[PDB]
């Protein structure tokens, strides 16, 4: 079960990628939007999931914000578990 929660890692990487793709898709078309290219969108996602939120990038559209919210929870839940498991096996 310990490394079975390590499956959250699987989920997270998927949400991060989908998030990045979806983020760009939602943001382009929004005048001034900066989250409009995949690479950095991918960086934005980690920045967001880890909840570090630097401010160098963020969504300005409604769906962009929705994708963001999903990524945030994914991150929080995911890291929650990996921490709880590392706490168990030690």
């Amino acid at each position, epitope marked *: 079960q310990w490394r079975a929660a390590g499956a959250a890692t699987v989920l997270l990487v998927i949400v991060l990628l989908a998030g990045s793709y979806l983020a760009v*898709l939602a*943001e*382009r078309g929004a*005048p*001034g*939007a900066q989250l409009i*290219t995949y690479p950095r969108a991918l960086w934005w996602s980690v920045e967001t999931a880890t909840t570090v939120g630097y401010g160098d990038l963020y969504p300005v559209t409604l769906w962009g914000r929705c994708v963001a919210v999903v990524v945030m929870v994914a991150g929080i839940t995911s890291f929650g578990l990996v921490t709880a498991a590392l706490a168990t096996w030690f």
Partner: antibody, heavy 118, light 108 residues
Framework: QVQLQQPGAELVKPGASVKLSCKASGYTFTSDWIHWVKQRPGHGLEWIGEIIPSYGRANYNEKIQKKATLTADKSSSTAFMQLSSLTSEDSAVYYC???????????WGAGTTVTVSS | DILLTQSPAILSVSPGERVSFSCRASQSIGTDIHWYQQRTNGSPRLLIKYASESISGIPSRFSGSGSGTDFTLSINSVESEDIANYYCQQSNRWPFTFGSGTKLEIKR
């Protein structure tokens, strides 16, 4: 091999519409965007709009009157730009270009010269 | 939307001389600037990406520099084949925009 193939020219009578095509080859990714750029003789490059074939969504330059409607056929790897109700102001070379979702136009088509005349 | 100013519109240089094209953005765009070359009756061709990254196939003669609002495209030792119009383009914010272009003229 030529990554983007566009027809050489299109003659359109004032008020009529025309559908330009852009046939793409080479590597294709879900992150590719196909852009269209307009260039009048002796003038610069003007961005018209973009479309993401993998999803089908299109965005347009808000600063100019909307003359185009973009679509894409995944099976034939072809992108289309429908220009409607044209006037001589619409006469120009229309390029299609491919962007790998990373901000720059890696490659351009040869361009289609559109002439609006009777 | 981001305005890209390319001035002067025409640049005259002597053969083998180094030349520099200017591109100024209305606001800071990091290094999200790309340069294209367009010869008479030809289609645009990517020369430099992200302000200073080389593109395979382009002569070493071409280089770029700058970040923020001011960018430069340089050609070391210009030659006839470099005669063309040069455009900058930004991808920092939507929508992507193009500069108005600078023509390279050689005084032989």
């Amino acid at each position: 091999q030529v990554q983007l193939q566009q027809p050489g020219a299109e003659l359109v009578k004032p008020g009529a519409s025309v559908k330009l095509s852009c046939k793409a080859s080479g590597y294709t990714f879900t992150s590719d965007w196909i852009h269209w750029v307009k260039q009048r003789p002796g003038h610069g490059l003007e961005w018209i709009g973009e479309i993401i074939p993998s999803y089908g969504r299109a965005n347009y330059n808000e600063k100019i009157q909307k003359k185009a409607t973009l679509t894409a056929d995944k099976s034939s790897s072809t992108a289309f730009m429908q220009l409607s109700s044209l006037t001589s102001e619409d006469s120009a070379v229309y390029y299609c270009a491919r962007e790998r979702g990373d901000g720059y136009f890696a490659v351009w088509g040869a361009g289609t010269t559109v002439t609006v005349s009777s | 939307d981001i305005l890209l100013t390319q001035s002067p519109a025409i640049l005259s240089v002597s053969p083998g001389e180094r030349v520099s094209f200017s591109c100024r953005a209305s606001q800071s765009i990091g290094t999200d600037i790309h340069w294209y070359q367009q010869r008479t009756n030809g289609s645009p061709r990517l020369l430099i990406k992200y302000a200073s990254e080389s593109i395979s196939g382009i002569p070493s003669r071409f280089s770029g520099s700058g970040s923020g609002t001011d960018f430069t495209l340089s050609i070391n030792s210009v030659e006839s084949e470099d005669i063309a119009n040069y455009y900058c383009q930004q991808s920092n914010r939507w929508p992507f925009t193009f500069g108005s272009g600078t023509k390279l003229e050689i005084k032989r």
